[PDB]
Design a protein around this nucleic acid. Structure first.
Ligand SMILES: Nc1nc2c(ncn2[C@H]2C[C@H](O)[C@@H](COP(=O)(O)OP(=O)(O)[C@H](Br)P(=O)(O)O)O2)c(=O)[nH]1
Ligand SMILES: [Cl-]
Ligand SMILES: [Cl-]
Ligand SMILES: [Cl-]
Ligand SMILES: [Mg+2]
Ligand code: NA
Ligand code: NA
Ligand code: NA
Length: 326
DNA sequence: GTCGG
DNA sequence: GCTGATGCGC
DNA sequence: CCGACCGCGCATCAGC
């Protein structure tokens, strides 16, 4: 929060470009600028000072000067007053509704929560669940609650098959005091990059979690990725806990390190790391790290026995999860 | 919108 | 039905 | 300049 005003401004601009302008590259330019500035250990005094940082150019520098001088940005003031931009930005806050759908709904006259509620028939499955829990999905999850959730997921997975290994990743693994959702990486010896000796591995787990009433809804579900909703159980007479978003990713057991690096994030950290990889002649995904041939074609997966092995390949000093929050 | 070559 | 493009999400 | 901007799973669609 040392430069909270500036990072908040840049994030708002990032969201505008992503949701309204549908300019993904500008969205990322703004997110990168905010990221590097949030990391800066000094209270910024000028746009010139900020321009010294990578990711901050002439345009953002000028904006930072206006913000420092007035405490606001005219470009944003106008955007906030524009009904169409405001309507679109809002609708995209519903899980399942992206920039395209938002603009389409606005075209149809659907611009508010009230509109959405009376037009459920016009929403697909995912969007319908997103609307249902709109308020809940806005709430943060205290780490204490993440711990209780972890306890349940690990114990329930254990009950299904003692050979499963469930790991909570995301901001939780990075040690955050609160998270926006729960991300679970799952492995089982029967599923490797060499073969799938058992079917329904992910299904079995989802089924068990629904059985004990932990998972309450499903946004999407496939052989390796589950995206849904969960809820901690409450005690007699006490108010129910808010529903929470949960993602479960089944990854080949032999590709655990690339998978846990990916699922631990942050998302910006992953982008920065993968981009650096490219510069070093390697490409990284949640399964492997491969060298790039003189032609630019990915080669065979390199041996990996720790997250650190991945960092070494790209000549980066190792960074613990708690230091990957970019 | 910002960067490298 | 399939394959490929697109939206949306992590 | 001016191209490059991380990489991928699932849902939904068009075209066949
Ligand atoms: N490569 C890549 N990985 C991504 C991306 N988006 C997410 N991931 C990876 C890295 C992410 O850490 C992880 C989970 O996505 P999450 O959105 O739940 O991210 P967190 O958990 O970090 C946020 Br702070 P919250 O849940 O506490 O509010 O997926 C992306 O665009 N690219
Ligand atoms: Cl763009
Ligand atoms: Cl690995
Ligand atoms: Cl791969
Ligand atoms: Mg998360
Ligand atoms: Na700069
Ligand atoms: Na959305
Ligand atoms: Na998540």
């Amino acid at each position: 929060t040392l430069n909270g005003g500036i990072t908040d401004m840049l994030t708002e601009l990032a969201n505008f470009e992503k949701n309204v302008s549908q300019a993904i590259h500008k969205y990322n330019a703004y997110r990168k600028a905010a990221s590097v500035i949030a990391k800066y250990p000094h209270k910024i005094k000028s746009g010139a000072e900020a321009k010294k940082l990578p990711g901050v150019g002439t345009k953002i520098a000028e904006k930072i000067d206006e913000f420092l001088a007035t405490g606001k940005l005219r470009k944003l003031e106008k955007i906030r007053q524009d009904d169409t931009s405001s309507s679109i930005n809002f609708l995209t806050r519903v899980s399942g509704i992206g920039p395209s759908a938002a603009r389409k709904f606005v075209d149809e006259g659907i611009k508010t929560l009230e509109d959405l509620r009376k037009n459920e028939d016009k929403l697909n499955h995912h969007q319908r669940i997103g609307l249902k829990y709109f308020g809940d999905f806005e709430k943060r999850i205290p780490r204490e609650e993440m711990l209780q959730m972890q306890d349940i997921v690990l114990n329930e997975v254990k009950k299904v098959d003692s050979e499963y290994i469930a790991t909570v990743c995301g901001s939780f693994r990075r040690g955050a005091e609160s998270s926006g959702d729960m991300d679970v990486l799952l492995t089982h010896p029967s599923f490797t990059s060499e073969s799938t000796k058992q079917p329904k591995l992910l299904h079995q787990v989802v089924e068990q979690l629904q059985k004990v009433h932990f998972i309450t809804d499903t946004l999407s579900k496939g052989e390796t990725k589950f995206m849904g909703v969960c809820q901690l159980p409450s005690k007699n007479d006490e108010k129910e806990y808010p529903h929470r978003r949960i993602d479960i990713r089944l990854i080949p057991k032999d590709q655990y390190y690339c998978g846990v690096l990916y699922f631990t994030g942050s998302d910006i950290f992953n982008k920065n790391m993968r981009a650096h990889a490219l510069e070093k002649g390697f490409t990284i995904n949640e399964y492997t790290i491969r060298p790039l041939g003189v032609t630019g074609v990915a080669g065979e997966p390199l041996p990996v026995d720790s997250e650190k092995d991945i960092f070494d390949y790209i000549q980066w000093k190792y960074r613990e999860p708690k230091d990957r929050s970019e």
